[PDB]
Structure formats: structure tokens, C-alpha cells
Amino acid sequence: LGFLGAAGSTMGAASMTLTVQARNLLSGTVWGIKQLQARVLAVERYLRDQQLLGIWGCSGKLICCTNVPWNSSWSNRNLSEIWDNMTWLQWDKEISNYTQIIYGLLEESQNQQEKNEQDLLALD
Amino acid sequence: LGFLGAAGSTMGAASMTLTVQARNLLSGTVWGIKQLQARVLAVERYLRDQQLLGIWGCSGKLICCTNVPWNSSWSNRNLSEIWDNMTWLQWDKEISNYTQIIYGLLEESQNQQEKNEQDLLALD
Amino acid sequence: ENLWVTVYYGVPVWKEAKTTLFCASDARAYEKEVHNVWATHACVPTDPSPQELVLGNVTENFNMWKNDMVDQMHEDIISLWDQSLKPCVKLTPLCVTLICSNATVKNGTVEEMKNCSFNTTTEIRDKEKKEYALFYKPDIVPLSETNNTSEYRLINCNTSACTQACPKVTFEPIPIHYCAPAGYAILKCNDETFNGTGPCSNVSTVQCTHGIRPVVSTQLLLNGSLAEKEIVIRSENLTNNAKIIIVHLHTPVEIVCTRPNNNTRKSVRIGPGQTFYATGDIIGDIKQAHCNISEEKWNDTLQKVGIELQKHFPNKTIKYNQSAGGDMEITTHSFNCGGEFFYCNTSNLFNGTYNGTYISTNSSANSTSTITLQCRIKQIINMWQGVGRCMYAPPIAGNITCRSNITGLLLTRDGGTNSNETETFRPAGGDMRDNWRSELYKYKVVKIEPLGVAPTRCKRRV
Amino acid sequence: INCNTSACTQACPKVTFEPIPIHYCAPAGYAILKCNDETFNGTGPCSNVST
Amino acid sequence: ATVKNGTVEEMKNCSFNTTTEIRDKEKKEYALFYKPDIVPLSETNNTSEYRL
Ligand SMILES: *[C@@H]1O[C@H](CO)[C@@H](O[C@@H]2O[C@H](CO)[C@@H](O[C@@H]3O[C@H](CO[C@H]4O[C@H](CO)[C@@H](O)[C@H](O)[C@@H]4O)[C@@H](O)[C@H](O)[C@@H]3O)[C@H](O)[C@H]2NC(C)=O)[C@H](O)[C@H]1NC(C)=O
Ligand SMILES: *[C@@H]1O[C@H](CO)[C@@H](O[C@@H]2O[C@H](CO)[C@@H](O[C@@H]3O[C@H](CO)[C@@H](O)[C@H](O)[C@@H]3O)[C@H](O)[C@H]2NC(C)=O)[C@H](O)[C@H]1NC(C)=O
Ligand SMILES: *[C@@H]1O[C@H](CO)[C@@H](O[C@@H]2O[C@H](CO)[C@@H](O[C@@H]3O[C@H](CO)[C@@H](O)[C@H](O)[C@@H]3O)[C@H](O)[C@H]2NC(C)=O)[C@H](O)[C@H]1NC(C)=O
């Protein structure tokens, strides 16, 4: 089904087999600079998202669930609603306003999950 | 602190906030070859250093361990001096003489750390 | 005790670097057509982000002359500004046998431009027809050293092939940032007590710099930044006279120039589908072009500068003297503003004496005390070597005023020894590398290698 | 007609103006959308969407 | 300038009209050329003339 093989579906209906999307983010060949800006576009686009995902310790594209509790005021709707009643479009449009904060929280709170789990393990 | 704000302070105070120094490697526009020849810096600098970190088994851009021991002849100072009092500048300037040995040992010793994982994991 | 070698990433460590760079200019590089302003294909909208930040106990040697932004700035200025007159008419028809006459105030204190004619190949290549247009007096060479006092030719076409600077391209100095690519970082100092080399005290870092001014001149320094409250002298080796001193002031002295003639355009169609411009029939009475400077403040600024050169010359008295010989391209103050080129001799700024006694002009009896600079003016230009030298600027219509400020001076010492008390101080033909190093010295670009090693007592499983 | 405006140039016979068709395709990372419904007067939503 | 009883392939001296750094101050010029680098203009009696 390619690039947009599950658009419009609920979250659970497309929370697996994401490989068919992430596996293809590079393309094209020679027309000088005006095209070659689309070849190194992968660095501008793919690697940025990759390092955002990897800085949190969520390297490896699973459903990575790490630290921060979900504050109720952000959506305030039940688990079933967000999980299987909503779709990605308006969910992104509603929550995209707060992701820059969430990534900062995820990366700044990451150091406390690894600061002492190397040498206390040595004692163990 | 941005790209270089954490500099100057001691490694005691620079053992954290590592991510801000490595989180940004992209911005700007297009000016042909003459400016595109900076964009491929990511291949020369970022991806190479990440491969360095990977073949040492240290995936994840945070602190990582190794199995290779210390040597007194290299540094010879007390723990507190290096660990809390000095900064990264003279530490890089001094220990860079022996980086070839560290790289070679961490390179070849990984074979001793992945030798027979097929039988050490088969029966679990 | 037992510990193991441990690896850190994101380490704040750097090395001095050389690298290819960016540019950034503010919103004023985008509104107009293609091929003007000269950053409109290239420069990114700047932001001062990330913000300027202080450092701790950092110690690095900022050598002024061991840098590549000055090299870079020259190669970029030259290589963009050399190709940036390619899309234009490029002459060759006019390299002819002009014919002249007299309109000459036979004994005037004036350096007027000449009227001659020429046979013009009209747009159709086999209907030739005559035409005329004025020409500034240096630009034309007589065809012959004989009694051929009629026959005259342009000074080009024996050396090269030139270009009429298209009017769409303005030469005006728009402020430019240069910037370094991501993964390289720039450093800066805030202190004013710099001397050229050595470890700086109040080190700082910026993503990239402030707004530079690319102007072009030889003796003095116009439009650009400034120091704050003390005069500072920067140079490599005071032992030798062969090298340039660069003088920054705490206050600028106030300069203005004008061309009172009211020039007008006279347009011809020459060659198929392209048009030549020339100075037309000059309206009004002929007057002489010039510059204007305030006598009281320039003398006071001389009085304030002398104490700086007596930091290292207490055994000899300061005196100023004329530009040390040479031709049109080095003896004069030669710069630009307003679409035309002036050539002005600053001997009436550089003679005097300071011998310790500072006697102020205050309270001022005549604030209008000025000393003037008489000028010639050109159209044809050889702006550099290895830049596609030969160019022609079409003349601007009307009359102009270019009030500006002396940001700094470039000077040069004259010799003396063996019971000599009369060393002196003269202009300098600072190259463009000796123009812009006044405005690029603050910054050094460094290369990060954030992979490092440190001790740790980790024993994660074998 | 010219010789007062600008220069002209004769296209060599090899450069024929055969309007030989052209597809398009966005770059990777980006995508193309489309919808088949046939009541779209320049604005408004659509149902039978495709890529 | 040929040595008819010779055996050597010597070059041909010729003269022509050339522009100068004033485009309407023409004067002639001379310089020699290797013979396989010049071809004759016509098969007619006007042979002495030639061209690159
Ligand atoms: C190849 O062909 C060329 C022509 O296409 C030949 O050039 C010609 O050479 C002859 C022989 O030298 C010239 O004719 C002579 O001109 C002199 C003038 O010299 C006098 O005046 C000058 C003034 O400065 C002075 O310096 C001298 O001392 C003399 O007082 C006459 O005096 C001679 O009698 C004779 O007329 C031609 O002028 C010249 N033609 C051109 C167009 O220059 C060339 O020699 C040929 N080369 C070979 C190897 O065959
Ligand atoms: C620069 O020099 C040229 C000549 O070398 C000047 O152009 C010529 O000027 C004369 C004198 O004005 C013109 O002659 C006059 O023509 C009128 C025709 O109505 C006649 O009534 C007068 O008695 C007189 O003969 C002449 O036509 C003109 N040349 C052409 C081709 O038009 C030119 O004016 C000079 N420029 C300056 C600023 O002095
Ligand atoms: C072309 O020439 C004319 C006449 O020379 C210029 O007009 C004159 O310009 C000067 C400034 O250069 C004006 O000076 C006045 O100065 C006083 C300061 O005492 C100030 O308060 C006034 O606001 C004014 O600026 C002068 O009034 C003005 N007119 C005359 C009759 O002199 C003209 O500016 C020149 N063109 C350019 C582009 O400068």
C-alpha cells in the first residue's frame, strides 16, 4: 500500500506494519543542483527526525513508552477515545502545539534513567 | 548552552548536558555547489563519528561503558583532579597522544566481546 | 583502584579550522529584481539565534592575520562581483578614432571633462552614423604622441575588454553578515583592550557575527563599525616600515562630498538591441567636485591619536607628511559612493605636529572651520587585478551628496635613525585585505569533534 | 522586426518542438495526493481520495 | 620562394590585412605558416591567394 497505505484509519488499525512507511524516504537521480537538493534533502528531513527519536533512548522504531505522565488537561478524554475513536489528522493538529515542550521534557529527563545504572550494576 | 556554552566548566559539570552539543547539525538555504559543499559535512563528521560510536557498541548518544582497563602511565593524576577540577580542553590536548592505542584496543577487543554469542544465547 | 576507559559523546572540544562558509543579510537583500541586490540568489534571512553566550576559563590565541574569513571574503567578493557584470553589454564598438575640439577654460583652476565625437555603427551594421558624448579627462589617451592633437582614444581596448556597469546593479554598500556552517562554531571577545595576538580575557561565542560593510577604498575608512572609548592601534611588527598600521578612533570625524555640476544622461542605441549611456550636455555653470571635512575635529582627532603612537615612540616627535609618491591609484583617497568614482588627494589632512602639548579647540570660535578636497572623477575603472579588471560605470543623473564618517585611517611610517627626532607618518594604500581586516578580526571559526574519552567505574555485563 | 530590441536565434532542426509528454513526481519524504470525485469547482473537501 | 631541385617541405610566406587596437586603423601583416595548414581559395587563375 505504499506511502499512505493506512491514512484516515484509527490508531490501533495502523499502529503496526509501519515499516512500509519508514522504509522508503529517499529517491531520484541526476539533474544538477536543482534536483540534488532533493538527494541531500534526506539529511535535512530523515536524519533530523531520527536523531530526535534516538536522543530520547527510543532508538529502534517500536511503540516506545518511557517517562512522562499524560497530563489530563491536554485532551481529558478517556483512553479508548484517543486510542481507537480518534484519527491522526485532528490529533496531530491538536497536540502539535505542545510537542516542542514534550521533546524537551523527554530529552532533559533522559539523563536520570542512566546516570548511575552502570556502576551500581557493578556492585550488583 | 547551545553549541559551545558547556565548554570551560569542568568535566564534573560537563558530564551532563551532553545532548545540547550534539543535537543541532543543520540549518540554512541553498547556494549551489559552493554552499552545498558544507551540507555533506554530515557524511564526513556526524555519520563517521556515529559509526565510531556504534562499532564500540555504544549506540545511543549518551555515556557508554567499555571492557578495556585504564593505565597509570597515560594520565597518572588523582581521581578528583581529572574528574572534577580540570576542563575538557587540556584533557583533550594531553590524552590525544594515546588516542591511537585507545581506538585500536576498543576496535580489536570487540571481537572478544561478540565471539560466540550464537551458543551463549541458543539455549536460553 | 580499578577503572576502565569510558567514552563520552557531545564533548565540548574544538580545534582551529578552515572551511567553506555561508552568508546572511537582513531583509534588505530580496525586494528588487534578479541580479540586484547581489545576495538575492544566495543569502539566507539571518537571525541572531542562538544567542551570544559567555564562556568560563577558556584561553585561546586570537591571531588576527591567521584566518580564512578575510581570504574567504576576498575570494567571494571577487568571484561573485567578477561574474556579476557578465550579463551586460561589453563594448568593442567604441575603440575608435574620436575627434575633439575646444570648450576649454584655458587657464581655469578646474579639471573639466572633454567633448569629442565618433562614427557610430547604428543598430543595422552597414548604416554608419556619427555621434558625440562627453568624457572625463584622464580616461582618454591621445592616439599618437605626435602633433595629432585632434585624435583621441579610450584607455582600454589596448589592454583588455571591459563592461558598461548595467544600471540595474547598484554599487551601494549593503551590510552583510558572513556565517559558518553547522558543526563549526565562531568565537568572539568583548574587551576593547586587544592588541593583535595573545590570549583574550573576556571570550564569547556567537552563531555568527554582526553586519559587515564591504566598501572599497585605499587611505581612509568609511561606513562600518566602531570601537567604544579608546583609540587602538593594530599591527604585526612595528620594527619594519613595510607593513600597515590600522587606526580605530573612539569618535568619528565628519565628512561629506558633492558634485555640483548637475550631470544629465544622453542615451544612444549602439549595436543590436543594446544601449550605451553617456554624460549629456552639461547644464549650468561648470563647478569643481570635492569633499568637505571639519578642521577643528580632525585636528583634535590628530591630537588624540598622537598619544597612541607615542606609546611606542617617546624618543621622536610626531609629524604628518604627504603620500609617498606614485601614480593615480595609490597617492590619493580613492573610494566610491552614489554610482560614480571620485579621486581626491588628502594632503590637506596630513601635515602638522603633535609634541605633547594638547591645546583643545574648546570653546569653539568657528565650528564651520573646514578643509576641502579637490577631486577628479572617472567612468572607466580597473577595480582590481584578477577580477575582470576593466569596467565602465554609466554616469548618474543630477547632483549628489554622500555625507559619511571616517571610521579609521591606514597610515605608514617614514624612516629615521642616528640622532633623528623627525620620524613622520603618511597614508597607506591598504589593499582590500588591508581594508576589511578592520571589520573581520574579531572572529575565529573552530571545528568540533564531540567524541571524547573519560574515566568511569562502570562494569556493565561482559 | 528585431535589430532594434534584442538578438534572435534559429533553432536547429534537430530541436523539434514535438510536445513530447511529461510526467511529474515529488521528492522522497514528500508525497502526491489526488481525488477522483468530479464535482470540484476549485475549492471544498473531497471523498474518493487517492495517492 | 621554392628550391625546385630540392627535397625539403618548407613553409609558405604570405601577407594579409588585420585589425588593431583602434578598430578602424587597419594595416597589413606578415607571418609564415606550415603548408598543410593553408588551402587555396579557388580553382581559377586567382591561385596566388589562399586562406586557412
Ligand atoms: C615574407 O613576406 C613579407 C611580406 O609579406 C616580407 O616583408 C617585406 O620585406 C621586405 C624586405 O625587407 C620589405 O621591403 C624593404 O623595405 C625596406 C625599408 O627599409 C628602409 O626603411 C626602414 C625604415 O625604418 C629602415 O629601418 C631601413 O634601414 C631602410 O632604410 C626597403 O629599404 C627595401 O628596399 C625593401 O623595399 C617590405 O617592406 C616587407 N613588407 C612588409 C609588409 O613589412 C618578408 O621579408 C618575407 N620573409 C621571407 C623570409 O621571405
Ligand atoms: C560637442 O561638439 C559638437 C561638435 O563637435 C557639438 O555639436 C554641434 O554643435 C554645433 C553648434 O551648436 C551645431 O551647429 C549648429 O546647428 C544649428 C542647427 O539648428 C545651427 O542653427 C547653428 O548655427 C549651428 O550651426 C551642430 O549641429 C552640432 N552637431 C550635430 C551633429 O548636431 C556639441 O554641441 C558639443 N557639445 C557641447 C556640450 O558643447
Ligand atoms: C544638489 O544641490 C542642491 C543645491 O546645492 C542641494 O540642495 C541643498 O542641499 C543642502 C544640503 O547639502 C541643504 O542644506 C540645508 O542645511 C541646513 C543646515 O544648516 C538644514 O537645516 C536644511 O534642512 C538643509 O538641509 C540646502 O538647504 C539645499 N538647498 C539649497 C538651496 O542649498 C541638493 O541637496 C543637492 N542634491 C543632493 C542629492 O544632495
Residue numbers in the entry:
A (entry chain B), B (entry chain G): 520 to 547, 569 to 664
C (entry chain F): 32 to 139, 150 to 185, 185A, 185B, 186 to 309, 312 to 321, 321C, 322 to 354, ...
D (entry chain A): 194 to 244
E (entry chain K): 134 to 139, 150 to 185, 185A, 185B, 186 to 193
Task: Provide the authors' original text about this structure.
The upper path from I2 leads to the I1 intermediate and then onto the mature DH270.4 and DH270.5 antibodies. Mutations in this I1 subclade were generally further from the antibody-antigen interactive surface with less clear structural impacts. The DH270.5 and DH270.6 antibodies acquired several mutations near the LCDR1/VL N-terminus where interactions with the N301-glycan D arms may occur. The cryo-EM reconstructions in this region were poorly resolved, precluding a precise definition of these interactions. Although the N301-glycan D arm was not well-defined in density, the VH and VL of both DH270.5 and DH270.6 acquired several mutations in proximity to the N301-glycan D arm.
The HIV-1 Env is a trimer of gp120-gp41 heterodimers that are heavily shielded from the host immune systems by N-linked glycosylation and further protected from neutralization by conformational masking and considerable sequence variability. A glycosylated region near the base of the third variable loop (V3) of HIV-1 Env forms a supersite of vulnerability that is targeted by antibodies originating from diverse germline genes in multiple HIV-1 infected individuals. Here, we determine structures of antibodies in complex with HIV-1 Envelope for all observed members and ancestral states of the broadly neutralizing HIV-1 V3-glycan targeting DH270 antibody clonal B cell lineage. Here we used cryo-EM to visualize the interactions of a complete inferred DH270 clonal tree with the co-evolving virus Env.
